[PDB]
Design a protein around this ligand. Structure first.
Ligand code: SAH
Ligand code: ZN
Ligand code: ZN
Length: 882
């Protein structure tokens, strides 16, 4: 009935070619081929616009139709082009982008365009339910082209109705996609918006003639019906004259880099870090400068210098594992597994999301509770043991395989040089004088295997290193916590220090033997970023149990290194180099250290202790902001009465915890947990915690555990996890373009680990024997299979896997009384077919059957690719391969 509807009918009538000639008739078009090539090849530092629509917005921007100012909100950001264009503008202070980005639609894109650090994307979000927030620039580009004008009208009035809520909040500028402005209802709603907010609809000359879309912008007014019918007129006159000749305009190229932001910096003890920052500043005088575009909001930024870039965003595929695991080529849970982006870019955006947060200081009463529970906990941990200095000889012996770490080229080469220990003696003297000059953190990226985000690699968590001397000073001052097993289960009740993955399940099962409610195993969202200054001062209680000579050194580490940190982080820089930024705060720690694990276990013991005190109504919510000596003495007596029992109801490894409380009130004790910033991951701040019914389903150290019965009726507790995680992690190789010899040794290492810990999963045992049947027998397993401290590496030997199996499970297992060894592989049991299927096995499917029949042809393929060597057919140790 309307002229636009006539355009819709006449448009549907056109065939393919006439559609193609009317699509580009007299429109303005940017050439996207170069940018599309850049984004196909994975280049994210070129600055090209990530979508056509960007240019659209640019038009509206540079002729006054919309101003981009202040806080920008983008409803339906898609790839994110409008967010990037807005973020590259000086007049913009922040950008929040939301999009569905699921089920076919385009997912957000992470690129280095200018202002990338002031954008916050959130996919899998329905904008129609998102409560409007106050902003200064409201953008919306939502609307799907349909063939029925009724569909366009209903979707359009839905969009405008939702946008009306966001406009009610009082926005200065806006640009809202009106998909079908020719429909009468859309005209009425638009007219009401014109009376209530101003603005008008504007046809964008970059819009293809295949859509009738116009844009409600705030920088002009006109008669809605008149200009809409004029745009319909133009679209019809263009349909009648189908020339397809396009007007030309240049595509969008934006600059790269970060932008400054409003800061929320806390106190900084400049005098404490002055010597270190001046040493770094002097060693790199040729590059030193203060970058006024640093993205740090909560970290104090001190300066930057220039080095070479490092890390990779690529994920290398282990060839033999990927070929043997072909039936999983279509599973997303395995294919989405990849290496972590260790480039300064992904490093820096992980720093943005997770590390650059602002911490809440625990309120006064919660702090007092922390002091009481902490002091009690340290009084109980130091009942038997005595703190002690660790020796140079212990350190040199530990250099066989250590962690958290230019005159020398190897650690062993440095600890053999007396000049190194001269430097150590000098920095130790400095620490004794209350000065520190070289103990600096280098925050480099950790090559981990994570699930890809969007379809590209997820950023890399950072592990903090120090030079060899600083780690020796830390080890001398506080290494006794590790070397004397302070976090042991015998010394702490809740600790699990020393117990490997093998025997960890016996702890959970033991907790299941107790009385009480369900199991709780809550993950903390970024534990290291939530360790407060209060947690650090609480951990400094060890100083009160030391000799003066020891307390001075340890105090120097704790105060000058853990609190007054100096951290060096990589950030992308022009050209092929990178900026090294020197930043500092007081309220975080790094996971790389080996003393980190002990103090995280102790502090988590304190945390779960407090939460259990709230769950038993010793303390509760009113006691958050403050606390009387009455309830404080109550808590004291409660620790006296039940402290050691509650500790024994815990399995704590660093930030991982498993608590078996008296009752399920534990799931609702959240006041102090949230007050201490130990916020639970993947849950609402005040939503009750997920309980657990069957202990065999409780997660701990990335695993769950099952009870298995051997052929001879005996029982063992085995670890298990989703098979998709094991295969996806086994399918990825760290190094670049490696030799088939390296990745074959890595594959043999994975096969040995699967044989040792995950033998009871049928695809995993068949996979192990297949791998060790395609890899030369005389080759030695190398590489890293796990990052867990509970992975003792027993599978990394050239031994027969059956004998290390009988060793760890029968010979060296304290829970196995009868030490009778198992003779053949076929006598080693499997999980129940139900439990195996429930934990990711592909048994039953005909693709795994065909896989198991044709696995030998693939084995021969891999042997051929590796070349001429001595192989062995291990598969004969299975029933159906004799
Ligand atoms: N219901 C919804 N809620 C949020 N975003 C949606 C949505 N439906 C579609 N979208 C997203 O909105 C995007 C529109 S493209 C417009 C945004 C911008 N021009 C750009 O892509 O760079 C699509 O990519 C789609 O993924
Ligand atoms: Zn130092
Ligand atoms: Zn399982």
């Amino acid at each position: 009935k309307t002229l636009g509807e006539v355009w819709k009918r006449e448009l549907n009538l056109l065939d393919k070619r006439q559609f193609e000639l009317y699509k580009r008739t007299d429109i303005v078009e940017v050439d996207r081929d170069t940018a599309r090539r850049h984004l196909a090849e994975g280049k994210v530092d070129t600055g090209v616009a990530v979508s056509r629509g960007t240019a659209k917005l640019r038009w509206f921007h540079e002729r006054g139709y919309v101003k981009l100012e202040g806080r920008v909100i983008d409803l339906g950001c898609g790839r994110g082009g409008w967010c990037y264009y807005a973020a590259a503008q000086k007049e913009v202070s922040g950008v929040k982008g939301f999009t569905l980005g699921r089920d076919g639609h385009e997912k957000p894109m992470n690129v280095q365009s200018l202002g990338w650090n002031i954008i916050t994307f959130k996919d899998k979000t329905d904008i129609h339910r998102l409560e409007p927030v106050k902003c200064d620039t409201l953008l919306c580009d939502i609307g799907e082209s349909s063939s029925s004008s009724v569909t366009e009208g209903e979707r359009t009035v839905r969009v405008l109705d939702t946008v009306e809520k966001w406009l009610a909040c009082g926005v200065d500028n806006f640009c809202v996609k009106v998909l079908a402005p020719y429909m009468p209802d859309v005209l009425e709603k638009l007219e009401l918006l014109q009376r209530r907010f101003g603005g008008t609809v504007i046809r964008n000359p970059l819009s293809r003639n295949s859509t009738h879309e116009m844009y409600y912008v705030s920088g002009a007014r006109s008669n809605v019906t008149f200009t809409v019918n004029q745009t319909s007129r133009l679209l019809m006159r263009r349909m009648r004259r189908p020339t397809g000749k396009v007007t030309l305009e240049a595509d969008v190229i934006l600059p790269i880099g970060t932008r400054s932001v409003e800061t929320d910096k806390g106190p900084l003890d400049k005098e404490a870090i002055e010597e270190r920052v001046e040493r770094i500043k002097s060693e790199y005088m040729t590059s030193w400068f203060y970058d006024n575009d640093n993205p740090y909001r909560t970290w104090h930024y001190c300066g930057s210098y220039v080095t070479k870039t490092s890390g990779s965003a690529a994920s290398m595929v282990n060839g033999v594992i990927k070929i043997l695991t072909y039936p999983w080529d279509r599973i997303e849970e395995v294919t989405r597994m990849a290496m972590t982006d260790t480039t300064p870019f992904g490093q820096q955006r992980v720093f943005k999301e997770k590390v650059d947060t602002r911490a809440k200081d625990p309120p006064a009463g919660t702090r007092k509770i922390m002091k009481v529970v902490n002091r009690w906990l340290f009084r109980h941990l130091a009942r038997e043991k005595n703190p002690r200095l660790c020796t140079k000889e212990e350190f040199i012996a530990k250099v066989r395989s250590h962690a958290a770490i230019e005159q020398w080229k190897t650690a062993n080469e440095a600890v053999q040089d007396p000049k190194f220990w001269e430097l150590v003696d000098e920095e130790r003297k400095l620490h004794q004088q209350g000065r520190c000059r070289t103990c600096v953190y280098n925050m480099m990226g950790k090559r981990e295997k994570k699930l890809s985000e969007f379809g590209k690699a997820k950023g890399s968590r950072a592990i903090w290193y120090m030079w060899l001397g600083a780690r020796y000073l830390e080890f001398e001052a506080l290494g006794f916590l590790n070397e004397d097993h302070w976090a042991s289960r015998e010394n702490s009740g809740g600790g699990v220090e020393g117990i490997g993955l093998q025997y960890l399940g016996y702890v959970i099962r033991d907790l299941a033997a107790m009385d009480g409610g369900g199991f709780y195993a809550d993950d903390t969202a970024g534990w290291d970023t939530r360790i407060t200054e209060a947690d650090l001062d609480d951990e400094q209680e060890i100083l009160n149990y030391m000799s003066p000579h020891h307390k001075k050194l340890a105090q120097a580490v704790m105060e000058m290194t853990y609190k007054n940190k100096v951290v060096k982080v990589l950030r992308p820089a022009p050209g092929g180099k990178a900026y090294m930024d020197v930043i500092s705060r007081r309220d975080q720690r790094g996971s790389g250290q080996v003393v980190t694990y002990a103090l995280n276990t102790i502090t988590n013991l304190k945390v779960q202790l407090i939460r259990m005190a709230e769950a038993e109504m010793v303390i509760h919510h009113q006691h958050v902001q403050d606390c009387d000596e009455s309830v404080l003495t109550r808590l004291e007596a409660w620790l006296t009465e039940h402290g050691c029992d509650r500790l024994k109801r815990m399995a704590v490894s660093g930030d991982d915890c498993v608590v078996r409380p008296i009752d399920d009130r534990f799931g609702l004790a959240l006041s102090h947990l949230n007050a201490m910033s130990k916020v639970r991951k993947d849950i609402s701040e005040w939503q009750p915690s997920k309980g657990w019914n069957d202990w065999e389903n409780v997660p701990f150290c990335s695993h769950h555990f099952h009870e298995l019965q051997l052929k001879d009726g005996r029982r063992i507790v085995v670890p298990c996890r989703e098979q998709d995680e094991l295969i996806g992690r086994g399918r990825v190789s760290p190094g670049n373009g490696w030799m088939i010899k390296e990745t074959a040794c890595l594959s043999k290492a994975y096969a040995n680990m699967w044989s040792l810990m995950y033998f009871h999963k049928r695809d995993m045992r068949l996979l192990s024997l297949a791998v060790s049947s395609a890899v030369p027998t005389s080759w030695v397993p190398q590489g890293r299979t796990t990052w867990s401290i509970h992975g003792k590496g027993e599978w990394m030997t050239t031994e027969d896997m059956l004998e290390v199996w009988n060793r760890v499970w029968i010979t060296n297992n304290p829970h196995m009384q009868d030490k009778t060894m198992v003779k053949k592989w076929r006598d080693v049991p499997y999980l129940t077919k139900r439990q195996d299927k429930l934990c990711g096995s592909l048994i039953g499917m005909t693709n795994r059957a065909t896989w198991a029949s044709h696995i030998h042809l693939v084995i021969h393929r891999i042997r051929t690719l590796i070349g001429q060597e001595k192989y062995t057919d291990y598969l004969t140790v299975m029933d159906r391969y004799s």
